Design a protein around this ligand. Sequence first.
Ligand SMILES: CCCOc1c(CCC)cc(-c2ccccc2-c2nnn[nH]2)cc1NC(=O)Nc1ccc(C)cc1
Ligand SMILES: CCCOc1c(CCC)cc(-c2ccccc2-c2nnn[nH]2)cc1NC(=O)Nc1ccc(C)cc1
Lengths: 363, 362
Amino acid sequence: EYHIDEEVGFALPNPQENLPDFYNDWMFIAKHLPDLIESGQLRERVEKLNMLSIDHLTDHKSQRLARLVLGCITMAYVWGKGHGDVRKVLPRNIAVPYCQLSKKLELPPILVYADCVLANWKKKDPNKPLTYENMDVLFSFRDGDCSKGFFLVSLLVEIAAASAIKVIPTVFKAMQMQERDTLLKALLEIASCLEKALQVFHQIHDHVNPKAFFSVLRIYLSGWKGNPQLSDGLVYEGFWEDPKEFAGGSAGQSSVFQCFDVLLGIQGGHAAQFLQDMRRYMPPAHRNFLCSLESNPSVREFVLSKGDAGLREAYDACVKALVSLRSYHLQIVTKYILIPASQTDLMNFLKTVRSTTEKSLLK
Amino acid sequence: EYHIDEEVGFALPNPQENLPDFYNDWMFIAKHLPDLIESGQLRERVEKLNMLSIDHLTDHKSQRLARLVLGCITMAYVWGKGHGDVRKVLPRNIAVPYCQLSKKLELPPILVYADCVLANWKKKDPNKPLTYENMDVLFSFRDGDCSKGFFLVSLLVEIAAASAIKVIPTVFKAMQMQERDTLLKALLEIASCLEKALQVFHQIHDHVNPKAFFSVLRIYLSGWKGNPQLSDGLVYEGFWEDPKEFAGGSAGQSSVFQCFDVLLGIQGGHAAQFLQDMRRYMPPAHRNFLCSLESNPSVREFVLSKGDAGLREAYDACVKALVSLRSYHLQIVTKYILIPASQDLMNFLKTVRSTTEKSLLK
Ligand SMILES: CCCOc1c(CCC)cc(-c2ccccc2-c2nnn[nH]2)cc1NC(=O)Nc1ccc(C)cc1
Ligand SMILES: CCCOc1c(CCC)cc(-c2ccccc2-c2nnn[nH]2)cc1NC(=O)Nc1ccc(C)cc1
């Protein structure tokens, strides 16, 4: 019901690769961003684009592909080469269909995790499994940006954590039937799956370069909420008369991070409001899921009420798995953002969320 | 999409009054609770009842009516006359269908606000409006329990607050189009509607007696979560082998209270977990609505960013309206619970009222 595949999880299973003949002009630009950004012929091709109606995007996978197409074009139109020459107005020809499509899918008109990671992938050979070697991305921004490395390693973590999500029904079924051994194995499988997701995340070092990420890709994943370059926001010509502020990319847009926090009862001020705001950037069905988990019986309260050492240890195994992921996430933010920048605000938020996870330990 | 009527709001519009011929034995008992409890024939009628399948309850209104029927019978079977003679096991021929129906509707197998208030009403004359004089309840527990007074005055507050809910789309539409004057009128209409709901709540004194409420009705609205009488819970024979703990009645089961807290950005520990637990006791469509409001742009953050005195004052008008309702609620809990008892719930209400007071801007 909440669009969560057993294998792929929150990611879009088998994303669509081609749009109908009607949107060939949109597809041409998005597929040639590395060439158009470098030559500078991008903004002219976006400005000389005719206004296409979103009526031919009938199914969810085509609507999601068109959002990925328009989203990547919008970030390339706004940032350009990334040397201060920025655009504060998105042309009517592209801003009104992108906002109509974003309204239909209940997502903000900005490139989001659901678009550039969850719907931006394919299998090279459909016979082989979901491994980096047998996978590729549909869209990139520049040659050498490490977008194949960044988006695929992010996606591989989502697929690794999807194994823990399919265990969630078993957790609540065991609490209803008072099956201690069934509940204990379920909590251990969630912990084992979250530990395996950390090992998958180690592959970032193999396929992403810190200099290329910080000074090339990171520009195209940046938004216009609190950014001094677009202090007031971006004007979506034809749709809104005032500039609108929408946030850029962040690990908080992944529903997997917030999924196990809500499952384990891990509930301050500036950090709490930011994570609640990040749900607006997730697909509507995934927010309805994160919220249905909140209204399910508390796993934390049940384990504490039983006064069982085994269940308390198995609960702390899942908590320690989340702190290990957030600690290693901070280590990667140091390598890919702090070190290249000095050649900070994000770290404080991550340190705060990690301390709240550590405080949720029972032992 | 979230089952919120424009006129009646979260309440069930036009609740069904009769069940199919198949459930006449269930209906007979529920409609005669005052007679069967007083004579003591109730438990014998529940125990000599045959097991009826819930397959003939096809539509939502019939399923909700059957949950109100079985819910009132279950509270009467558990508590009885209310003099310590309590039942710790609900018979298989009523516990299984009630749990099957509760699972289908995604509600706990215990009498809940959605049942005894939202689906427990009718219009005497369909031509006249929704006023206490033109309304009545479908089920009562005892003669003189003031259930018509308690459930109808609770419902009339829900209908009064429903006028504020229909302006919620206007609040978000104004924020998206930067219309300061339409947003200010919208916040003032929410405040005016929540102030009118407080005036409709004053009618409780006219139709409910403190002694009758505390020593008669209150026992049938009590549950088995933390209750020393059913320390372990209630055994739903045939459905679960272990006793289960489900909470009784409270104002927290109303979605209207949490609706405007989420709309205005009003969020400690024991109080926060209790309100999140009370969502489980609300209908599934209503808890999905309270959660969709959380993922909408913050009204509190907008009024603060604009730095406008008018919007700040109109926001505080809605906050002060919530503070007035919670202060008058505490005031009624003193009259109908604290005074009759001397012849804990207060701490929770004082805590949730201080959090509302703290969210004022001025
Ligand atoms: C559970 C999956 C989370 O995935 C991420 C992880 C994994 C952590 C367990 C790490 C990082 C990261 C890596 C290097 C440097 C910095 C960051 C970083 N983490 N926060 N902020 N910056 C990033 C993400 N995701 C992300 O950037 N998505 C996104 C991308 C593009 C758009 C438009 C929207 C969302
Ligand atoms: C939408 C309005 C809120 O409704 C209530 C208000 C209005 C306050 C604005 C007051 C009271 C109250 C009155 C007298 C003495 C005590 C209480 C009391 N307040 N907390 N707990 N007891 C009660 C409720 N509601 C309620 O009892 N519902 C319920 C009833 C039965 C079952 C099975 C489930 C839920």
